[PDB]
């Protein structure tokens, strides 16, 4: 069965981003599209599930030279007294049947938390203690001692934007959408490329797919710089270099892990 | 759980008894001591069976000649099965307390 | 209204080192500047209230729960009480060589629970916007990180702003602390002119802080390190019990003793 | 007692029409959502590494209102949107638990998978028997702790006790607050629970290097404008607006040191302080914690520092600060 | 009488609303149907659907069955249980008791009603201290004679404040009492 074709038809226009990126991977003819998917009323329904007799009657009386309004009409249509009680008992039983279809912790080193990841003679204490004890025999010098005009002016100049302690562009708009779309494409493909990269996966069938994805990295990064070139030759302003870091770091991881694999071999 | 009933000391399997159980046991012991037919009512569906059985067993131990045996009747067999379960639990508790088997027989027809 | 709390780090070791150095700045002038700041804070409005805490190596003590010079009676009482209590605390103090690092986490905990008590007692009609103007004066202690982080998170939940005013040293823990709760961080390099910094950067309350230009926040280095040799690490291997940042993959982390199963 | 610091929790809300009944002062559904907003925010504030997910079940169908995420604001917005939900239909425990199981099956073993079913309508119409699903839940070690409303449901009682969770029924709104606040805290790890090391990454906030030289412009990663500076990743190298967040590429959790430090108080619970009403030779009128006179005949003391704390001081310390001020010294 | 009431509720919309709120099961003279209905009722009680079991006080099911925790939580009594005043066997049984042992006919009739009601309403308190409420939807029970002949344990719990509650007031107090009993000891 063409289940893949049916799914592609379903998602062809319902979701714009998914098909946009999947098509983009083929617009420049990067790779085959197989890997793309390889890696990744109420009343009548209630009656249908309630009355098996109604189900059989519907199957035998499927609309044929009749009308659904007439079928609806057929629904509602001491001997009668006991029939009502029996009907409730049977109906509740049918509803119920339809609903029933088949370590104390111990530690040896706690001061490590007291000094967590945050990083980092005797007569001196005596001298400082006595000196500070004798320091404050006089108090309330606020009248002049606390502040001076020259120091205040220096502080205000420092607080000025050009002073110390106080250091002090949305021109492009349409380029924003293109950058977002490119970032989404990079994320989409990096997801599969990094899906099993961190795990060692020392198996033949597991490593085959990482090798294929690593080649796909070369093949996609082949086309990325061409769009980069198109965008660059406009104004030579507002450089977009963050995208380069992702590609270069992915390449560095690829090559370093290749060398590590060769060393392990 | 050994209860120092006014008449005698009576064993009891569960940990605690409500005051209504004390009243039930004392009234029942009064009736047995009088050796006269009587009627009494207790609310709980369960618990009355264990209290009654324990008191009757203790009275039998104290005055075996006074009472030859107990004939405990229930409405239905499914119900009397629960009674025999309660009696089995009580006998196991008493046997553990005594440390050995005693000449006591209990059965349902 | 606003409830201000000044947590002064009056470390005798460091301030007495300054006294021995005979530098221009002194603990007396620091206390006077803090006093002036509190007086101005209450001067702002009647409903506003303040409190003061002093830190020492042993413990931390509150410095605050006619018109002889023609003075406002309430501020006169504040001046007298703070002066007397600070002199008493500095004059009387035991000596313990083993413990010399200044204590700040306990003082901040006292401040937080004091603010909670005041918030409970105050009438529900008026809303109180409390603040803690921490004034550090000495290097922090490594062993206090955990408790200080606890109190910082409690302050974040309770909506109190920790405005740090470190001087003579940049405490990474304290800057991290104020960054979490959004309090301002000012490092005054001119100690003699410290009070001008208070009457501008710190004095304005949270109500008007947004609608005012103040020095930009300093970048915070949220570093992580393994528990072995104490060094920056970008990737940490924590477990589900210790929640501890470690060096490298190990059969079992020492602080856990758990029976980790390989895979 | 071993505790699972990292837990993926699903708050299953039922959009039954029994929720229409205004048993509580406001509408039942509105009250549950309003309080569940607070529950979500507090849960994130008390377990940053953990993440939450909401499944809304109505008309015999369960829909994922919000997938697993580390951002409380997104879930809060989802709650506010759901406040206006029609609230008509009948819930299906099988459907809701199956959706939760499908999402949680691929979750890492080390993390604790948990479900909190806020059950309102006692009925449970399901396509398949739930006793069979109970076996799969036990096999998958997914803790399920139901909170019933106005009903002691037997199927949910057996669900909770068999799967290891706890069952409760709302006595009133105040007790509802207490129940959810209790469920906020991490549950103790039982014998079936297992612990394993989890890869973690610690990013550093970065800005323009020097006067916007060799800048690193970028918009966001899950209408974001250009950002001069922000967080980054050791491996993704993709700008992240806020932390903590799971990597969109690596699959590794990015989280800073304070977020981890926020959970140490769980490992270090504070021992309850004995309450002595009488003064007991406590001549200090001022409470040490708050330096205020003790206006009530109550005092609290530790077993180490032996300090004095009033009712408010002790309550606050054991509730929020989670550490004794004087006893820190 | 049960059939007549059920038929009236069916003609009105009350019965459909009851069906929506909770499952409904009814008793019949035939033992096989009674057993099947009760077997399904137990499963309904175990599940969250719930069940409303309509039965007759003289029905063998009422005497045979025992209701425990999460079974027959709220026992509803619709009307004082009285035997038909035409069955001639009871006429001999009753007039003979009047002639000998000197029991008034009304006295014995009310005794036969109260004993039967106590039998059919006393099941919810089986054991293990399982909460539950017994609501009697009949002003006759409010009469002093019925209360006096009621068993002591039920009567002493019964109070004048809730003796003759309106339907709505009874519903509210039942909700509050269930709230109180929900919480642990
Ligand atoms: Zn290391
Ligand atoms: Zn560990
Ligand atoms: Zn990443
Ligand atoms: Zn206090
Ligand atoms: Zn303490």
Swiss-Prot record, chain A:
Subcellular localization(s) per the UniProt record: Nucleus
Post-translational changes noted in the entry: (Microbial infection) Upon Rift valley fever virus infection, interacts with NSs leading to ubiquitination by the NSs-FBXO3 E3 ligase and proteasome-dependent degradation.
UniProt KW keywords: Acetylation, DNA damage, DNA repair, Host-virus interaction, Nucleus, Phosphoprotein, Repeat, Transcription, Transcription regulation, Ubl conjugation
Job of this protein: Component of the general transcription and DNA repair factor IIH (TFIIH) core complex, which is involved in general and transcription-coupled nucleotide excision repair (NER) of damaged DNA and, when complexed to CAK, in RNA transcription by RNA polymerase II. In NER, TFIIH acts by opening DNA around the lesion to allow the excision of the damaged oligonucleotide and its replacement by a new DNA fragment. In transcription, TFIIH has an essential role in transcription initiation.
GO MF term list: chromatin binding; nuclear thyroid hormone receptor binding
Highest classification ranks of the organism: Eukaryota, Metazoa, Chordata, Craniata, Vertebrata
Family of this protein: Belongs to the TFB1 family.
Segment forming the signal sequence: none
Species per Swiss-Prot/TrEMBL record: Homo sapiens (Human)
Residue stretches making up the BSD domain: 1-40, 41-77
Protein name per its UniProtKB record: General transcription factor IIH subunit 1
Section covered of the full-length record: 107 to 547 of 548
Swiss-Prot record, chain C:
Keyword Protein biosynthesis attributed: no
Gene Ontology CC entries for this record: core TFIIH complex portion of holo TFIIH complex; nucleoplasm; nucleus; transcription factor TFIID complex; transcription factor TFIIH core complex; transcription factor TFIIH holo complex; transcription preinitiation complex
UniProt record, GO biological process: DNA repair; nucleotide-excision repair; regulation of DNA-templated transcription; transcription by RNA polymerase II
Location in the cell: Nucleus
Keywords, comma-separated and alphabetical: DNA damage, DNA repair, Metal-binding, Nucleus, Transcription, Transcription regulation, Zinc, Zinc-finger
InterPro entries associated with the record: TFIIH_Tfb4/GTF2H3, vWFA_dom_sf
NCBIfam families to which the protein is assigned, alphabetical: tfb4
Family: Belongs to the TFB4 family.
Protein name: General transcription factor IIH subunit 3
Species this chain originates from: Homo sapiens (Human)
Gene label: GTF2H3
UniProtKB/Swiss-Prot annotation, chain D:
Recorded consequence of changing residue 287 to A: No effect on the transcriptional activity of the reconstituted TFIIH complex
Family: Belongs to the GTF2H2 family.
Tissue: Widely expressed, with higher expression in skeletal muscle.
Domain VWFA: from-to ranges: 8-184
One of the protein's GO biological processes: G protein-coupled receptor internalization
GO molecular-function term, one example from the UniProt record: RNA polymerase II general transcription initiation factor activity
Outcome recorded upon mutating residue 305 to A: No effect on the transcriptional activity of the reconstituted TFIIH complex
Function: Component of the general transcription and DNA repair factor IIH (TFIIH) core complex, which is involved in general and transcription-coupled nucleotide excision repair (NER) of damaged DNA and, when complexed to CAK, in RNA transcription by RNA polymerase II. In NER, TFIIH acts by opening DNA around the lesion to allow the excision of the damaged oligonucleotide and its replacement by a new DNA fragment. In transcription, TFIIH has an essential role in transcription initiation.
Outcome reported for the amino acid change (mutating residue 250 to A): Reconstituted TFIIH complex lacks p62 and has no transcriptional activity
Gene that produces this protein: GTF2H2
Descriptive protein name: General transcription factor IIH subunit 2
Source organism (scientific name): Homo sapiens (Human)
Main location: nucleus
Zinc fingers (C4-type) by residue: 233-250
Swiss-Prot record, chain E:
Mutagenesis / variant outcome for changing residue 115 to H: In TTD1 and XP-D; able to open damaged DNA and incise damaged DNA
Domain of life: Eukaryota
Compartments reported by the entry: Nucleus; Cytoplasm, Cytoskeleton, Spindle
Position of sequence motif Nuclear localization signal: 139-152
Processing and modification events after translation: ISGylated.
Family to which this protein belongs: Belongs to the helicase family. RAD3/XPD subfamily.
Note on domains (UniProt): Interacts with GTF2H2/p44 via the C-terminus of this protein; mutations in the C-terminal region of XPD do not alter its helicase activity, but prevent its interaction with and helicase stimulation by GTF2H2/p44.
Function summary: ATP-dependent 5'-3' DNA helicase. Component of the general transcription and DNA repair factor IIH (TFIIH) core complex, not absolutely essential for minimal transcription in vitro. Required for transcription-coupled nucleotide excision repair (NER) of damaged DNA; recognizes damaged bases. Sequestered in chromatin on UV-damaged DNA. When complexed to CDK-activating kinase (CAK), involved in transcription by RNA polymerase II. In NER, TFIIH acts by opening DNA around the lesion to allow the excision of the damaged oligonucleotide and its replacement by a new DNA fragment.
Protein name: General transcription and DNA repair factor IIH helicase subunit XPD
Organism: Homo sapiens (Human)
Included range, full protein: 544 to 728 of 760
